[PDB]
Design a protein around this ligand. Structure first.
Ligand SMILES: *[C@@H]1O[C@H](CO)[C@@H](O)[C@H](O)[C@H]1NC(C)=O
Ligand SMILES: *[C@@H]1O[C@H](CO)[C@@H](O)[C@H](O)[C@H]1NC(C)=O
Length: 162
């Protein structure tokens, strides 16, 4: 019902943002994706972030018009990262007690929409999200000039069949 990510340090409740997108890195009818650890420069090539600076997930960025869209400089080269832009932003709510919470049902539908787009692009039936420096292995984001780190293993640890 709710996914509760542990965070360090405790992000204030007004640091809660909107997940407008993320960045993946591709590793049969089974293709595996992981949250990218590339530098914030590699984040820039997605061109869908807003003002906040964040790893693994795009907070407070731009949304797609109708449906989820995925872009890549080259789908053949796996070193190139996949830029996922959400159509409906998923809300991440920090409570100030050391955890930022996300609704499980909405992230599941988001992962299913992403899987459907990744299925059309790679022709595979099964899309698997596997977990990921500490700044890039975690969902790290800058709120109010202060940096935070959240364990994102709960977000990227699922499977999605056809
Ligand atoms: C994202 O935007 C919301 C609403 O504008 C704001 O409350 C929140 O602090 C922003 N997130 C960051 C990390 O600045
Ligand atoms: C962005 O987040 C704010 C609160 O943090 C929320 O009111 C707003 O609906 C979110 N944006 C979208 C498009 O849902």
């Amino acid at each position: 019902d709710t996914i509760t990510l542990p965070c360090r340090p405790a992000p204030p409740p007004h640091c809660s943002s909107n997940i407008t997108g993320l960045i993946l890195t591709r590793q049969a009818n089974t293709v595996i994706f992981r949250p990218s650890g590339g530098d914030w420069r590699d984040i820039a090539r997605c061109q869908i972030a807003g003002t906040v600076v964040s790893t693994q997930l795009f907070l407070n960025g731009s949304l797609a018009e109708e449906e989820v869209v995925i872009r890549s400089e080259d789908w053949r080269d796996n070193a190139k990262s996949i830029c996922v832009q959400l159509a409906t932003s998923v809300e991440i709510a920090c409570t100030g007690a050391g955890h930022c919470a996300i609704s499980r049902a909405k992230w599941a539908n988001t992962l299913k929409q992403i899987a459907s787009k990744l299925r059309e692009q790679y022709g595979a039936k099964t899309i698997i999200f596997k977990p990921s420096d500490p700044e890039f292995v975690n969902h790290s984001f800058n709120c109010g000039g202060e940096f935070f780190y959240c364990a994102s293993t709960q977000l990227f640890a699922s499977t999605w069949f056809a």
